[PDB]
User: Which sequence fits this backbone?
């Protein structure tokens, strides 16, 4: 991840005009949609929290959690810490990031700061759902000037995306004012 | 450098009881001593600054600044960022690290935060002098509970080092209260 840290703008775009910041959400959403697309009920929920973090939930199969035999850490950690630009870029540029994976009846949780995992991916409970959820807090050491998410920027893009991804339900929620949208196209 | 940030304890020592924290200084000092050994004068100065940073100055040749043919960045940057434990460890665990090299008539300067270079090593001026200086501010995300440098802990170790490195003068200064020592065998 140090390559990204060294030159953030080569990976995420302009980190001062808001464009980079919103790219962060779109990269996460891209991964989520690819997760949702590989199930029948396909749903993703994009939430803008009051603390200016964003979470993206998918009801997919759940990112793989097994230990990667070469890297010696969970496959999820590898995905979040190695290398659309990849989710590891979002992680590298987040002051915090919380990963929650439901798979094989288990809840898996990990936390990152600035791309550095605070502990190994841990089974912390049980569940009968499946899916991956990523919530991130953009690094204010990187993103300057425009540091808060614009509901409308997200809405427009999610709506455009809905017509390309048939059968995928996409919900957008803004916890700062209670605004909500649901984009779900026919097919 | 992510393997150090992932388990800093394994590289530097205990990060909650003051062990790791002082060890950051000792690693830097080892590098400085190596440098002072290969020049004339042979002196290092260790300074505790009032803002809980430490600086370690040598009067050595200056560490090399030329571009590293494999890594493609200055050799000094290679030293500060690619994995005694290595000064890269110190750099990785410091919220800020300032590097100043006086080499071949020129002053070179670089700033890191959490081991990330803010810019490439750059020529900033001319000088007569030779030497390397690193000043580092230990990360308060890593180092907890014991977060202020203890004078006498540094003093104890430097004294031992003075006997082992016979020709080297080691000065220790505390800017918080003016305390000072001079260890020279
Ligand atoms: N946020 C997600 O749901 C996600 C899903 C799969 C891979 C990476 C991700 O960030
Ligand atoms: N601080 C020094 O005088 C030093 C000298 C050589 C290499 C790394 C260093 O930290
Ligand atoms: N605050 C902060 N910024 C960082 C950048 C890279 C790794 C760790 C860091 N902690």
Assistant:
């Amino acid at each position: 991840l140090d390559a990204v840290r060294k030159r953030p703008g080569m990976y995420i775009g302009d980190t001062d005009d808001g464009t980079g910041l919103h790219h962060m959400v779109f990269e996460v959403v891209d991964n989520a949609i690819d997760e949702a697309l590989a199930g029948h009920c396909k749903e993703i929920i994009v939430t803008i929290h009051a603390d200016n973090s964003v979470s993206v939930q998918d009801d997919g199969r759940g990112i793989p959690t097994g230990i990667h035999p070469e890297e010696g850490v969970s496959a999820a950690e590898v995905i979040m810490t190695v290398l659309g630009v990849g989710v590891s870029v979002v992680n590298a540029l987040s002051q915090k990031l919380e990963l929650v994976i439901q798979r094989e009846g288990k809840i898996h949780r990990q936390i990152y700061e600035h791309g550095v995992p605070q502990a190994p991916l841990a089974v912390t409970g049980e569940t009968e759902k499946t899916g991956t959820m990523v919530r991130f807090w953009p690094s204010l050491e990187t993103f300057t000037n425009v540091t808060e998410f614009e509901y409308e920027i997200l809405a427009k893009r999610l709506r455009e995306l809905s017509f390309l991804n048939s059968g995928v339900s996409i919900r957008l929620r803004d916890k700062r004012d209670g605004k909500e949208d649901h984009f779900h196209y026919e097919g």
